[PDB]
Amino acid sequence: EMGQGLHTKMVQVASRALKIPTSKIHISETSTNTVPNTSPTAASASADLNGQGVYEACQTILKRLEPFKKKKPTGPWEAWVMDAYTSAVSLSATGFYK
Amino acid sequence: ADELVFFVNGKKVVEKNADPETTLLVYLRRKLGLCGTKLGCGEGGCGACTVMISKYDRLQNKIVHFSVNACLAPICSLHHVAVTTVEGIGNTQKLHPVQERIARSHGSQCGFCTPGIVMSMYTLLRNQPEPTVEEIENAFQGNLCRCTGYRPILQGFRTFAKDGPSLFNPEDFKPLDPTQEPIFPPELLRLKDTPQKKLRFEGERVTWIQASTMEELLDLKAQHPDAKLVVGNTEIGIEMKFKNMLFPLIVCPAWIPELNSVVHGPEGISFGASCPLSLVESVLAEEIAKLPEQKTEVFRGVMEQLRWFAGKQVKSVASIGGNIITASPISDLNPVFMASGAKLTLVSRGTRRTVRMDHTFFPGYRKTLLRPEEILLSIEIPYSKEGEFFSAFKQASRREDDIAKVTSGMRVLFKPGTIEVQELSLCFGGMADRTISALKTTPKQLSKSWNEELLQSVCAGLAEELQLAPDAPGGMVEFRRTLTLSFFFKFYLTVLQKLGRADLEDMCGKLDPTFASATLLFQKDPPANVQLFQEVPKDQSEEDMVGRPLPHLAANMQASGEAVYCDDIPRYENELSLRLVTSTRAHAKITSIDTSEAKKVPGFVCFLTAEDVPNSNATGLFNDETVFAKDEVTCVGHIIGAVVADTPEHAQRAARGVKITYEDLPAIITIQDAINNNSFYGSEIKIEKGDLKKGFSEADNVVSGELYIGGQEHFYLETNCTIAVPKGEAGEMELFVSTQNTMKTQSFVAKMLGVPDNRIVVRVKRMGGGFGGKETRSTVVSTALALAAHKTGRPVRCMLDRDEDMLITGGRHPFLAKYKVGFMKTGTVVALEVAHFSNGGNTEDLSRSIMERALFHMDNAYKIPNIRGTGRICKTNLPSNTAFRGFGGPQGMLIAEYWMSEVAITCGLPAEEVRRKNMYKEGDLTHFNQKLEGFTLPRCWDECIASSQYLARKREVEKFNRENCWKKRGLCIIPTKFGISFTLPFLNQGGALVHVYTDGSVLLTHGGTEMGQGLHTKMVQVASRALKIPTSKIHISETSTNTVPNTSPTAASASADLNGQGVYEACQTILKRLEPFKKKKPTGPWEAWVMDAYTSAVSLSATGFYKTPNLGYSFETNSGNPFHYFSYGVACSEVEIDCLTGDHKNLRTDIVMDVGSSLNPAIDIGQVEGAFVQGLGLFTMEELHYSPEGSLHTRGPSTYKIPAFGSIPIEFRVSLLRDCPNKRAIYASKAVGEPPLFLASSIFFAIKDAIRAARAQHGDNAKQLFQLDSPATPEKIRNACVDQFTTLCVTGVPENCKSWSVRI
Amino acid sequence: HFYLETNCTIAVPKGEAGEMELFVSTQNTMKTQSFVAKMLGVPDNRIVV
Amino acid sequence: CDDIPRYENELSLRLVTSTRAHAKITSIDTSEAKKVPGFVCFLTAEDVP
Ligand SMILES: Cc1cc2nc3c(=O)[nH]c(=O)nc-3n(C[C@H](O)[C@H](O)[C@H](O)COP(=O)(O)OP(=O)(O)OC[C@H]3O[C@@H](n4cnc5c(N)ncnc54)[C@H](O)[C@@H]3O)c2cc1C
Ligand SMILES: O=c1[nH]c(=O)c2[nH]c(=O)[nH]c2[nH]1
Ligand code: FES
Ligand code: FES
């Protein structure tokens, strides 16, 4: 983030992908020990590239939560997540795009 | 003058405003930033702060070197010396041989004690380049290690000794070149030729005068009698730090030549009062070597006491005068000085007098007959005369660096050519508020002949004269009384022997040869150790390190003091310090809080309480705890609030100015208190199988009884510590924490603040030990600190002092068991009922899970067809007890082995036969209906029984016992079964994240935390195999909630299993991605595949995850598997007890352990040894004492005696079972951390066997199936060896009187 | 460019294994890491930007 | 970046740059720099590991 509102856009993207409010998603920083081998934030293309990456990481999480969603299609986001956690399902994912 | 000038690692320090209250440890760490030197205790008992001092000694005219405790050395005592720290001898770029050998020999696990031990060994080598094995062990009397079990440290350092597949190769150790040590600062040599002048230092509260001449000292003492002398500071430093005493004017006389002199006179040797005992020791040693035995009786008495007096660090600076004038009731020297009538010269301006230490020298508690203006100049220790014999005695909890329970000096003078008593002196410490003489007993024996009548007279006399009040400070009233008589008996026999060697055998009679062993002075044979493990296949790549003894990845850094623990992190310029304020009442309403005095302390910022909590004051694993006390306090140590100040000194002072008013509420302390008040965490837990009525009715015999098992303090050498750094945006905070549980730290901070978890990052690089103590209880510091940071917008730090940590953070659960066992005459057990009670303290925490694991292990290794166990967790007004390595298993299994011991005795059959024939077999179901597959225990048993030559050794033990009346041996072999997996199924999960950078280097992280168990090392070994690249290309830097989320605690021995699988999966994903590049260039190197993947836009980042499958037990239905697999092992231990003192030697232990296919045999053997020695402490040494009002008395290494270097089995053999792959864990390994700990029960039951022999010897009537609670301390051992001495000392507990301590 | 914030680096040495953490005003964490690591002669895995 | 609090042991760096478009460096004299209070070191190419 250099004032172009990239984190703002990625949160907006993630919120649509996950179908939860933006209030429940946070970005703190960019770091080589969380995402390696990154291209510079340049060529106007950072929302294009990182938005797809974010989208894919979100889709993985969704896919992992869908058994818990089916079992409780009304019960809130928080219940799906806790259910996944106590069934020992991973709540961490990478995403990538080229 | 008033500039303080000294050197640190060769660099001159000029301190223009030295404060007398500043310790060297604080100066090194906080002023100079040299954090290799550690705080472990602040009271001189652990040696984590050891450094070397060099100076030009003007009196001896040469450069000298000695070791000190930096925690107790005032910088104002250090003018014109040269300090060397661990940083001063070497670094990872060029390690000193001492650093290299401790690292490479697997002598550094958690690493927190490593610098201190390094500096003890370093100092020894600077003084003696070719030490003996004995001198090496002696170097570490004042160093503690909680992880290693000590064996590898000594084994590595044995390579320096003049008198000297494998885990390490000493042949590869680089040689010592002493010309390459640091120069003695030339400036100090120059300055040696200037007169010393008097220096004056002025601090916030204290003035320090370093006096250069006797005149200045006596003048100052005349004009200001209040001036407090300080020499070594090893008492004053304690009084100041622990008893809140302030002496605003101090005078240090250490430089004054008259106080440092040694004069050989006709009557004896006179020591200046400021002579260190190190100098007394070397002077008396040489005197004893060269003079006739007849003249050195008293010298040898002093030396005997100095053997067991602290360690090298304390004795280097502690003065003979300081010990005398301190006038502790438990002085080890004053009894000897008094018994020998040692001559003290006292002076003041214009007065000189000489006195003989007798009863009148010590009038009252900590007083002498010195006038306030008088100092002690010298003490003459006397030559012994013909017919004059001397003995000194000390019995403590542990032999090395411990405080006397009873200590004594005893002297007799015979009328010449006779066996008639001319003089008799019997003096004791630990029997009164002062050093006392047995003045009513002793004169009656004058003119008597040294014979059985005198023995019986003196014992009757001592028992009447040396009364103790039930409430006597220290408790252990019966034991202490027994010791006075027991010591006299040894003296009696010793004098018989000494008479004998004076050709008067005919007159006094010879010693019955079965009594001779009673009079031997402690000697321990040199150690002999064996480590057996399995070689990896000949085919295995040299780059595949799985199953190889790779040293801990941080070992070199730990040896060099470069490894960073939480408090070693540099402070931000705006960083504040936090001090917790805790309840001094077990149960009370908080009436009011007065912060008026606290606000006056310079740098005070604020006092945080429940009202300052932004969101929720409800915390802890079951949400039943406060962040800060609200309305009532429910234990002594309950956190009420927290002071925030600029510095720790100012936070501590301000905290003392927080005055709290209480109104007491009914307190529930003990397990019994809880049973009577029906106060429990939840309902009864129960496992039951078969038919209990039938079994008992079928049984030939039934035995009932109880067992009490004392709790345990973790004594991680690094206490609890958190730094919280507020980021100023969106509630973001980063915490650096010594914790095994990042997830709960994160959750608890977030909930307290009312922010989402995604705002809070918790980072753990490494812990200086955890052992379960940091699975949950770390959060009580983390939340406090987080709040301070939030409130102030500034980083805030808190590291607990040892006393704080030990009081607040709780321990292993004490257990009370009531059992009833039914068995046949053959020793086969057919029925068992056990009720378990644990003392959980004032929050639930992990108590219920700990009870479940105890119940899951009440079988130990034994098939019992009809069985019923219950557990109940008591809710009390004590600190909340928590996880400790074993987590209820050790307690469960000790009870099992205890009734098992009584089955064997009742049947009159050999215990090993009875254990073996009750042992499970392959395919059996446990009492909880889990099938035992891959049941290796019988193999472990047969190998151990054979390699330890158990049967031949039985014969030697029996023979020893028939030939010795006052020493006995015992021998026992104990098995164990330990279920692997968290009792809560869903905690059996872990995650990893891996990156490959475009240079080919790999950055790995996983949910596990490093606490010295070598978890990161193992995960690197795993990743290296999985990726097929050298370990050198893979790095783990830290554990963090923002790299791997929702991690279970590093606990349940499980972390290598879970994180190993996660790492493996993450690695498999990367390999799947590189496959197409591998295929195109199959020999082209790893770096080329990676760069190719990168330039092909292929992700080089992956998560990995694992969950342990098929787990979930139901108590309702006694079905489902709680465990993934079981660990198995056997230990055979031999002991020799002192029937007169309760001391014992651990002669030999042999362990066979099933660790599957070890991931790392060096680490796994280290875990076996470490775990075993923690169990050794639990069952035989470690004891917590509480006031009747629930206040912990035991708050430091002075009173809490963990195993020392000298505690471990002399002969210590560990074998990892060969050829036992465990399919269902990572690379066929098994978890190792907790299962070995219970095998130290072998020492407990070996002691129990020896005691049984002692009771057969001297008992008469003696109850068979006598009681031995845990821990089996010297007190319990001695009290159980009933004899003519105990019989004359027993009786009391007059009804419900007040006593020092209550069993909780 | 006249970015209102000029170029700025904080580098924090960790004293273990060549590890170093850098706080940087940069659009390019990867090349920052790479260039620091090559200059020091340590692997990328020791350097966090 | 510069709003991050300094560590109590934190140092400051200042680059020394060429005042010529194209030249040989004939010599460097740090003798006046060494006189400045708080001066620690002057890094050059020879310091690169
Ligand atoms: C880890 C540890 C272990 C210990 N173990 C033991 C043990 O096993 N047995 C035992 O007996 N003690 C033990 N001690 C106590 C202590 O080490 C000794 O009492 C030591 O001899 C004190 O000497 P010092 O020079 O450090 O005294 P300081 O603390 O400097 O002074 C102690 C007292 O003596 C006074 N004083 C000192 N010199 C003179 C003088 N010439 N004239 C008048 N007053 C004087 C001081 O004013 C002060 O009141 C231990 C202490 C520690 C920290
Ligand atoms: O089954 C266990 N659960 C835990 O939470 C834990 N913690 C520990 O030290 N050992 C164990 N064992
Ligand atoms: S910290 Fe100094 S001896 Fe423990
Ligand atoms: S390695 Fe010694 S205390 Fe940890």
mmCIF file with all atom_site columns, N, CA, C and O and ligand atoms in Angstrom, chain B residues 44 228-229 231-236 273 309-310 319 323 325-326 331-332 376 394 402, ligand 1:
data_model
loop_
_atom_site.group_PDB
_atom_site.id
_atom_site.type_symbol
_atom_site.label_atom_id
_atom_site.label_alt_id
_atom_site.label_comp_id
_atom_site.label_asym_id
_atom_site.label_entity_id
_atom_site.label_seq_id
_atom_site.pdbx_PDB_ins_code
_atom_site.Cartn_x
_atom_site.Cartn_y
_atom_site.Cartn_z
_atom_site.occupancy
_atom_site.B_iso_or_equiv
_atom_site.pdbx_formal_charge
_atom_site.auth_seq_id
_atom_site.auth_comp_id
_atom_site.auth_asym_id
_atom_site.auth_atom_id
_atom_site.pdbx_PDB_model_num
ATOM   1   N N   . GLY B 1 44  ? 21.238 -16.459 44.105 1.00 0.00 ? 44  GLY B N   1
ATOM   2   C CA  . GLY B 1 44  ? 22.542 -17.102 44.133 1.00 0.00 ? 44  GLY B CA  1
ATOM   3   C C   . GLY B 1 44  ? 22.488 -18.617 43.980 1.00 0.00 ? 44  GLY B C   1
ATOM   4   O O   . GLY B 1 44  ? 23.521 -19.272 44.015 1.00 0.00 ? 44  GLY B O   1
ATOM   5   N N   . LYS B 1 228 ? 26.324 -0.037  57.342 1.00 0.00 ? 228 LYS B N   1
ATOM   6   C CA  . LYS B 1 228 ? 26.172 -1.498  57.197 1.00 0.00 ? 228 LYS B CA  1
ATOM   7   C C   . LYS B 1 228 ? 27.403 -2.036  56.450 1.00 0.00 ? 228 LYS B C   1
ATOM   8   O O   . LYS B 1 228 ? 27.676 -1.626  55.320 1.00 0.00 ? 228 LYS B O   1
ATOM   9   N N   . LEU B 1 229 ? 28.170 -2.922  57.097 1.00 0.00 ? 229 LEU B N   1
ATOM   10  C CA  . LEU B 1 229 ? 29.278 -3.522  56.405 1.00 0.00 ? 229 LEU B CA  1
ATOM   11  C C   . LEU B 1 229 ? 28.706 -4.428  55.305 1.00 0.00 ? 229 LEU B C   1
ATOM   12  O O   . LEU B 1 229 ? 27.730 -5.140  55.526 1.00 0.00 ? 229 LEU B O   1
ATOM   13  N N   . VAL B 1 231 ? 30.608 -7.121  52.454 1.00 0.00 ? 231 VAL B N   1
ATOM   14  C CA  . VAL B 1 231 ? 31.803 -7.732  51.890 1.00 0.00 ? 231 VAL B CA  1
ATOM   15  C C   . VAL B 1 231 ? 31.365 -8.488  50.630 1.00 0.00 ? 231 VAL B C   1
ATOM   16  O O   . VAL B 1 231 ? 31.384 -7.910  49.584 1.00 0.00 ? 231 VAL B O   1
ATOM   17  N N   . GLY B 1 232 ? 30.903 -9.732  50.758 1.00 0.00 ? 232 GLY B N   1
ATOM   18  C CA  . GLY B 1 232 ? 30.452 -10.521 49.576 1.00 0.00 ? 232 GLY B CA  1
ATOM   19  C C   . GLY B 1 232 ? 29.034 -10.191 49.120 1.00 0.00 ? 232 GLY B C   1
ATOM   20  O O   . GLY B 1 232 ? 28.679 -10.494 47.999 1.00 0.00 ? 232 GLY B O   1
ATOM   21  N N   . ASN B 1 233 ? 28.211 -9.590  49.990 1.00 0.00 ? 233 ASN B N   1
ATOM   22  C CA  . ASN B 1 233 ? 26.823 -9.186  49.679 1.00 0.00 ? 233 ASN B CA  1
ATOM   23  C C   . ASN B 1 233 ? 25.892 -10.407 49.524 1.00 0.00 ? 233 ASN B C   1
ATOM   24  O O   . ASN B 1 233 ? 24.748 -10.284 49.080 1.00 0.00 ? 233 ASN B O   1
ATOM   25  N N   . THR B 1 234 ? 26.362 -11.599 49.895 1.00 0.00 ? 234 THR B N   1
ATOM   26  C CA  . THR B 1 234 ? 25.611 -12.814 49.626 1.00 0.00 ? 234 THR B CA  1
ATOM   27  C C   . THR B 1 234 ? 24.534 -13.019 50.704 1.00 0.00 ? 234 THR B C   1
ATOM   28  O O   . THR B 1 234 ? 23.721 -13.910 50.561 1.00 0.00 ? 234 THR B O   1
ATOM   29  N N   . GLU B 1 235 ? 24.574 -12.229 51.788 1.00 0.00 ? 235 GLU B N   1
ATOM   30  C CA  . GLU B 1 235 ? 23.448 -12.120 52.761 1.00 0.00 ? 235 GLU B CA  1
ATOM   31  C C   . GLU B 1 235 ? 22.689 -10.797 52.568 1.00 0.00 ? 235 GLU B C   1
ATOM   32  O O   . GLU B 1 235 ? 21.495 -10.801 52.376 1.00 0.00 ? 235 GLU B O   1
ATOM   33  N N   . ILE B 1 236 ? 23.404 -9.662  52.642 1.00 0.00 ? 236 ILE B N   1
ATOM   34  C CA  . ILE B 1 236 ? 22.813 -8.302  52.441 1.00 0.00 ? 236 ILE B CA  1
ATOM   35  C C   . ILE B 1 236 ? 22.035 -8.240  51.112 1.00 0.00 ? 236 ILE B C   1
ATOM   36  O O   . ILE B 1 236 ? 20.955 -7.678  51.041 1.00 0.00 ? 236 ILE B O   1
ATOM   37  N N   . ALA B 1 273 ? 38.682 -11.192 58.685 1.00 0.00 ? 273 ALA B N   1
ATOM   38  C CA  . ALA B 1 273 ? 37.216 -11.441 58.670 1.00 0.00 ? 273 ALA B CA  1
ATOM   39  C C   . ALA B 1 273 ? 36.637 -11.347 57.251 1.00 0.00 ? 273 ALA B C   1
ATOM   40  O O   . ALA B 1 273 ? 35.579 -11.910 57.002 1.00 0.00 ? 273 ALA B O   1
ATOM   41  N N   . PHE B 1 309 ? 28.663 -26.123 51.184 1.00 0.00 ? 309 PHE B N   1
ATOM   42  C CA  . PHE B 1 309 ? 28.354 -24.715 51.408 1.00 0.00 ? 309 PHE B CA  1
ATOM   43  C C   . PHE B 1 309 ? 28.229 -24.028 50.038 1.00 0.00 ? 309 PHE B C   1
ATOM   44  O O   . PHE B 1 309 ? 29.238 -23.759 49.407 1.00 0.00 ? 309 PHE B O   1
ATOM   45  N N   . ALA B 1 310 ? 26.996 -23.801 49.571 1.00 0.00 ? 310 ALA B N   1
ATOM   46  C CA  . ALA B 1 310 ? 26.744 -23.105 48.276 1.00 0.00 ? 310 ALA B CA  1
ATOM   47  C C   . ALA B 1 310 ? 27.567 -23.753 47.141 1.00 0.00 ? 310 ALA B C   1
ATOM   48  O O   . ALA B 1 310 ? 27.584 -24.984 47.006 1.00 0.00 ? 310 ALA B O   1
ATOM   49  N N   . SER B 1 319 ? 32.356 -14.085 52.799 1.00 0.00 ? 319 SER B N   1
ATOM   50  C CA  . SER B 1 319 ? 33.456 -13.989 53.780 1.00 0.00 ? 319 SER B CA  1
ATOM   51  C C   . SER B 1 319 ? 33.128 -14.813 55.026 1.00 0.00 ? 319 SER B C   1
ATOM   52  O O   . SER B 1 319 ? 31.993 -15.053 55.358 1.00 0.00 ? 319 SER B O   1
ATOM   53  N N   . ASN B 1 323 ? 29.645 -14.762 57.448 1.00 0.00 ? 323 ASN B N   1
ATOM   54  C CA  . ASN B 1 323 ? 28.877 -15.898 57.945 1.00 0.00 ? 323 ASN B CA  1
ATOM   55  C C   . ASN B 1 323 ? 28.678 -15.784 59.465 1.00 0.00 ? 323 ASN B C   1
ATOM   56  O O   . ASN B 1 323 ? 27.596 -15.993 59.986 1.00 0.00 ? 323 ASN B O   1
ATOM   57  N N   . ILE B 1 325 ? 28.851 -13.087 61.493 1.00 0.00 ? 325 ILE B N   1
ATOM   58  C CA  . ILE B 1 325 ? 28.109 -11.930 61.993 1.00 0.00 ? 325 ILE B CA  1
ATOM   59  C C   . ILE B 1 325 ? 26.662 -11.989 61.496 1.00 0.00 ? 325 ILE B C   1
ATOM   60  O O   . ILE B 1 325 ? 25.784 -11.503 62.201 1.00 0.00 ? 325 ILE B O   1
ATOM   61  N N   . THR B 1 326 ? 26.396 -12.629 60.347 1.00 0.00 ? 326 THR B N   1
ATOM   62  C CA  . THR B 1 326 ? 25.009 -12.851 59.895 1.00 0.00 ? 326 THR B CA  1
ATOM   63  C C   . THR B 1 326 ? 24.215 -13.564 61.001 1.00 0.00 ? 326 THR B C   1
ATOM   64  O O   . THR B 1 326 ? 23.041 -13.311 61.238 1.00 0.00 ? 326 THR B O   1
ATOM   65  N N   . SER B 1 331 ? 23.575 -21.242 60.106 1.00 0.00 ? 331 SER B N   1
ATOM   66  C CA  . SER B 1 331 ? 24.987 -21.184 59.800 1.00 0.00 ? 331 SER B CA  1
ATOM   67  C C   . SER B 1 331 ? 25.580 -22.597 59.883 1.00 0.00 ? 331 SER B C   1
ATOM   68  O O   . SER B 1 331 ? 25.293 -23.316 60.839 1.00 0.00 ? 331 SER B O   1
ATOM   69  N N   . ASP B 1 332 ? 26.380 -22.982 58.880 1.00 0.00 ? 332 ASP B N   1
ATOM   70  C CA  . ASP B 1 332 ? 27.062 -24.253 58.907 1.00 0.00 ? 332 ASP B CA  1
ATOM   71  C C   . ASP B 1 332 ? 28.422 -24.108 59.585 1.00 0.00 ? 332 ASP B C   1
ATOM   72  O O   . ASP B 1 332 ? 28.974 -25.121 60.005 1.00 0.00 ? 332 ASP B O   1
ATOM   73  N N   . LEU B 1 376 ? 34.345 -7.195  63.346 1.00 0.00 ? 376 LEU B N   1
ATOM   74  C CA  . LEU B 1 376 ? 35.142 -8.417  63.539 1.00 0.00 ? 376 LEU B CA  1
ATOM   75  C C   . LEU B 1 376 ? 36.432 -8.284  62.716 1.00 0.00 ? 376 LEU B C   1
ATOM   76  O O   . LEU B 1 376 ? 36.381 -8.018  61.503 1.00 0.00 ? 376 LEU B O   1
ATOM   77  N N   . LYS B 1 394 ? 26.039 -32.011 58.521 1.00 0.00 ? 394 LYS B N   1
ATOM   78  C CA  . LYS B 1 394 ? 25.004 -31.209 57.886 1.00 0.00 ? 394 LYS B CA  1
ATOM   79  C C   . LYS B 1 394 ? 24.026 -32.161 57.196 1.00 0.00 ? 394 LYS B C   1
ATOM   80  O O   . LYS B 1 394 ? 24.438 -33.061 56.517 1.00 0.00 ? 394 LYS B O   1
ATOM   81  N N   . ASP B 1 402 ? 22.588 -26.235 49.441 1.00 0.00 ? 402 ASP B N   1
ATOM   82  C CA  . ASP B 1 402 ? 21.351 -26.288 50.174 1.00 0.00 ? 402 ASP B CA  1
ATOM   83  C C   . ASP B 1 402 ? 21.574 -25.723 51.579 1.00 0.00 ? 402 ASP B C   1
ATOM   84  O O   . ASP B 1 402 ? 22.699 -25.519 52.007 1.00 0.00 ? 402 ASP B O   1
HETATM 85  C C1  . LIG E 2 .   ? 23.151 -19.367 47.197 1.00 0.00 ? 1   LIG E C1  1
HETATM 86  C C2  . LIG E 2 .   ? 23.581 -19.210 48.650 1.00 0.00 ? 1   LIG E C2  1
HETATM 87  C C3  . LIG E 2 .   ? 23.946 -20.303 49.413 1.00 0.00 ? 1   LIG E C3  1
HETATM 88  C C4  . LIG E 2 .   ? 24.338 -20.170 50.757 1.00 0.00 ? 1   LIG E C4  1
HETATM 89  N N1  . LIG E 2 .   ? 24.670 -21.268 51.446 1.00 0.00 ? 1   LIG E N1  1
HETATM 90  C C5  . LIG E 2 .   ? 25.057 -21.184 52.734 1.00 0.00 ? 1   LIG E C5  1
HETATM 91  C C6  . LIG E 2 .   ? 25.416 -22.403 53.493 1.00 0.00 ? 1   LIG E C6  1
HETATM 92  O O1  . LIG E 2 .   ? 25.369 -23.556 52.970 1.00 0.00 ? 1   LIG E O1  1
HETATM 93  N N2  . LIG E 2 .   ? 25.748 -22.247 54.774 1.00 0.00 ? 1   LIG E N2  1
HETATM 94  C C7  . LIG E 2 .   ? 25.818 -21.059 55.399 1.00 0.00 ? 1   LIG E C7  1
HETATM 95  O O2  . LIG E 2 .   ? 26.193 -21.054 56.623 1.00 0.00 ? 1   LIG E O2  1
HETATM 96  N N3  . LIG E 2 .   ? 25.512 -19.910 54.741 1.00 0.00 ? 1   LIG E N3  1
HETATM 97  C C8  . LIG E 2 .   ? 25.113 -19.917 53.459 1.00 0.00 ? 1   LIG E C8  1
HETATM 98  N N4  . LIG E 2 .   ? 24.813 -18.743 52.774 1.00 0.00 ? 1   LIG E N4  1
HETATM 99  C C9  . LIG E 2 .   ? 24.871 -17.438 53.464 1.00 0.00 ? 1   LIG E C9  1
HETATM 100 C C10 . LIG E 2 .   ? 26.043 -16.543 53.047 1.00 0.00 ? 1   LIG E C10 1
HETATM 101 O O3  . LIG E 2 .   ? 26.635 -17.014 51.853 1.00 0.00 ? 1   LIG E O3  1
HETATM 102 C C11 . LIG E 2 .   ? 27.140 -16.580 54.085 1.00 0.00 ? 1   LIG E C11 1
HETATM 103 O O4  . LIG E 2 .   ? 26.595 -16.273 55.395 1.00 0.00 ? 1   LIG E O4  1
HETATM 104 C C12 . LIG E 2 .   ? 28.311 -15.699 53.727 1.00 0.00 ? 1   LIG E C12 1
HETATM 105 O O5  . LIG E 2 .   ? 29.405 -16.129 54.557 1.00 0.00 ? 1   LIG E O5  1
HETATM 106 C C13 . LIG E 2 .   ? 28.038 -14.242 54.023 1.00 0.00 ? 1   LIG E C13 1
HETATM 107 O O6  . LIG E 2 .   ? 29.254 -13.549 53.819 1.00 0.00 ? 1   LIG E O6  1
HETATM 108 P P1  . LIG E 2 .   ? 29.278 -12.198 52.927 1.00 0.00 ? 1   LIG E P1  1
HETATM 109 O O7  . LIG E 2 .   ? 30.706 -11.760 52.969 1.00 0.00 ? 1   LIG E O7  1
HETATM 110 O O8  . LIG E 2 .   ? 28.541 -12.420 51.610 1.00 0.00 ? 1   LIG E O8  1
HETATM 111 O O9  . LIG E 2 .   ? 28.403 -11.270 53.871 1.00 0.00 ? 1   LIG E O9  1
HETATM 112 P P2  . LIG E 2 .   ? 27.671 -9.847  53.570 1.00 0.00 ? 1   LIG E P2  1
HETATM 113 O O10 . LIG E 2 .   ? 26.315 -10.234 53.051 1.00 0.00 ? 1   LIG E O10 1
HETATM 114 O O11 . LIG E 2 .   ? 28.538 -8.852  52.878 1.00 0.00 ? 1   LIG E O11 1
HETATM 115 O O12 . LIG E 2 .   ? 27.461 -9.395  55.112 1.00 0.00 ? 1   LIG E O12 1
HETATM 116 C C14 . LIG E 2 .   ? 26.663 -10.179 56.001 1.00 0.00 ? 1   LIG E C14 1
HETATM 117 C C15 . LIG E 2 .   ? 26.568 -9.610  57.424 1.00 0.00 ? 1   LIG E C15 1
HETATM 118 O O13 . LIG E 2 .   ? 27.843 -9.580  58.033 1.00 0.00 ? 1   LIG E O13 1
HETATM 119 C C16 . LIG E 2 .   ? 28.213 -8.227  58.399 1.00 0.00 ? 1   LIG E C16 1
HETATM 120 N N5  . LIG E 2 .   ? 29.701 -8.204  58.294 1.00 0.00 ? 1   LIG E N5  1
HETATM 121 C C17 . LIG E 2 .   ? 30.452 -8.703  57.302 1.00 0.00 ? 1   LIG E C17 1
HETATM 122 N N6  . LIG E 2 .   ? 31.745 -8.609  57.614 1.00 0.00 ? 1   LIG E N6  1
HETATM 123 C C18 . LIG E 2 .   ? 31.831 -8.063  58.844 1.00 0.00 ? 1   LIG E C18 1
HETATM 124 C C19 . LIG E 2 .   ? 32.901 -7.694  59.806 1.00 0.00 ? 1   LIG E C19 1
HETATM 125 N N7  . LIG E 2 .   ? 34.194 -7.873  59.509 1.00 0.00 ? 1   LIG E N7  1
HETATM 126 N N8  . LIG E 2 .   ? 32.520 -7.151  61.011 1.00 0.00 ? 1   LIG E N8  1
HETATM 127 C C20 . LIG E 2 .   ? 31.210 -6.958  61.304 1.00 0.00 ? 1   LIG E C20 1
HETATM 128 N N9  . LIG E 2 .   ? 30.201 -7.289  60.488 1.00 0.00 ? 1   LIG E N9  1
HETATM 129 C C21 . LIG E 2 .   ? 30.476 -7.823  59.290 1.00 0.00 ? 1   LIG E C21 1
HETATM 130 C C22 . LIG E 2 .   ? 27.379 -7.346  57.518 1.00 0.00 ? 1   LIG E C22 1
HETATM 131 O O14 . LIG E 2 .   ? 27.101 -6.017  58.007 1.00 0.00 ? 1   LIG E O14 1
HETATM 132 C C23 . LIG E 2 .   ? 26.123 -8.163  57.423 1.00 0.00 ? 1   LIG E C23 1
HETATM 133 O O15 . LIG E 2 .   ? 25.298 -7.868  58.540 1.00 0.00 ? 1   LIG E O15 1
HETATM 134 C C24 . LIG E 2 .   ? 24.396 -18.846 51.408 1.00 0.00 ? 1   LIG E C24 1
HETATM 135 C C25 . LIG E 2 .   ? 24.053 -17.750 50.638 1.00 0.00 ? 1   LIG E C25 1
HETATM 136 C C26 . LIG E 2 .   ? 23.666 -17.889 49.302 1.00 0.00 ? 1   LIG E C26 1
HETATM 137 C C27 . LIG E 2 .   ? 23.325 -16.646 48.512 1.00 0.00 ? 1   LIG E C27 1
#
